[PDB]
Every structure is written in structure tokens, then in C-alpha cells.
Amino acid sequence: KVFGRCELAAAMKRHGLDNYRGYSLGNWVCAAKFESNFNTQATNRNTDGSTDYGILQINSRWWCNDGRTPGSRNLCNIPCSALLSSDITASVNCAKKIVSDGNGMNAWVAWRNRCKGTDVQAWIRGCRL
Ligand SMILES: [Cl-]
Ligand SMILES: [Cl-]
Ligand SMILES: [Cl-]
Ligand SMILES: [Cl-]
Ligand SMILES: [Cl-]
Ligand SMILES: [Cl-]
Ligand SMILES: [Cl-]
Ligand SMILES: [Cl-]
Ligand SMILES: [Cl-]
Ligand SMILES: [Cl-]
Ligand code: NA
């Protein structure tokens, strides 16, 4: 599924990401934009051989099992394919674990390089939330 911007904002709010660990909703929308272009089916291979999955590009090195990432953990205890669903529940629940792991949203490279330090409220402007 390719989400609309406000559609995704509302789904993320319903799932409790607004101000989760202090990160306002616009941070999460901004991250999703630059990670996946709001597309739940997005996949991208990393240099290390791991793959990133879904709307928040969650990595198979640490977080999900894709059967082809040696020496990898599965700390969200999920198959990586579950992160491609039109239902973002698995992605959100796994993201809550990631952001709680010590480095906040710096775990998402695109957030650090494209969203951090910017006016992230712009990403939810206009949305009925
Ligand atoms: Cl929308
Ligand atoms: Cl957009
Ligand atoms: Cl914030
Ligand atoms: Cl915001
Ligand atoms: Cl497997
Ligand atoms: Cl694996
Ligand atoms: Cl393969
Ligand atoms: Cl694991
Ligand atoms: Cl959902
Ligand atoms: Cl933090
Ligand atoms: Na893994």
C-alpha cells in the first residue's frame, strides 16, 4: 500500500507514535517519507548483505528474520515479510523497540540526515488528527 501523508499520520497517531519517547508525529512521517516514500512494500539491500523492509525500513541484521542474513538477530521476533503488510501494526510495534534501544531515532539514517534539525511539523500540516 502507498499511504497518503495524512493517512499515514493518522495511522501512526492511532498506534501511539505521537510523542513516543519524545518524538513528535512529524518526525515519524518525515522518516517514513525518506525511508520508503510511504510504500509498505519497499525493500532495499544494505551493503552488509542485510535488507531493510517496509514503511520504516526495518533491518534484518537486528530486528526481523528474512532467512538470508547470516549472524543476524530477530529482536522483534517477526518474519521480515510481515513488515510489508498494508496494516502497519507490526512495523510500529517493532519501531517502538528500536527507538527505545538507546540512540533514539538516530537508528534511522534518513531521519538523522534529512529530518533531524528541520521543521518536521510541516509533515503533518493540514492533516485532521
Ligand atoms: Cl492522505
Ligand atoms: Cl508527500
Ligand atoms: Cl519532537
Ligand atoms: Cl510534529
Ligand atoms: Cl526463515
Ligand atoms: Cl537470517
Ligand atoms: Cl536471495
Ligand atoms: Cl534475535
Ligand atoms: Cl494500520
Ligand atoms: Cl532520544
Ligand atoms: Na535477522
UniProtKB/Swiss-Prot annotation:
Protein name per Swiss-Prot or TrEMBL: Lysozyme C
Similarity remark: Belongs to the glycosyl hydrolase 22 family.
Organism: Gallus gallus
EC class (word): hydrolase
Keyword Hydrolase: yes
Residue span, C-type lysozyme domain: 1-129
Gene: LYZ
GO annotation, cellular component aspect: cytoplasm; endoplasmic reticulum; extracellular space
InterPro entries in the record: Glyco_hydro_22 (IPR001916), Glyco_hydro_22_CS (IPR019799), Glyco_hydro_22_lys (IPR000974), Lysozyme-like_dom_sf (IPR023346)
Further details from the record: Lysozyme C is capable of both hydrolysis and transglycosylation; it also shows a slight esterase activity. It acts rapidly on both peptide-substituted and unsubstituted peptidoglycan, and slowly on chitin oligosaccharides.
Subunit description: Monomer.
SS bond list: C6-C127, C30-C115, C64-C80, C76-C94
Record flagged with keyword Thylakoid: no
